[PDB]
């Protein structure tokens, strides 16, 4: 296919742990350990010969 079923991309939004109380320019390297779960349904119609 030229235009196949598209890729479906997913991630957990990062949640930072408590940042310092004095400002620092670095990116935040400390996050809350976290994961997600859920359900996935996929319904494909098919044509027969």
């Amino acid at each position: 296919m030229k235009h196949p079923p598209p890729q479906i991309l997913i991630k957990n939004t990062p949640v930072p742990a408590d940042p310092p109380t004095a400002f620092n320019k670095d990116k935040l390297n400390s996050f809350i350990t976290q994961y997600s779960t859920g359900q996935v349904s996929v319904e494909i119609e098919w044509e027969l010969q």
């Binding site: 957990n12 994961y35 859920g38 319904e43």
Partner: peptide, 27 residues
Amino acid sequence: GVGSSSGNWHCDSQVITTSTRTWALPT
């Protein structure tokens, strides 16, 4: 909301096939 369901499980084939699974996504 928190106390309600956003979707119902569907797992049947009619031709229309349907699948449903449970997933876990790490970081």
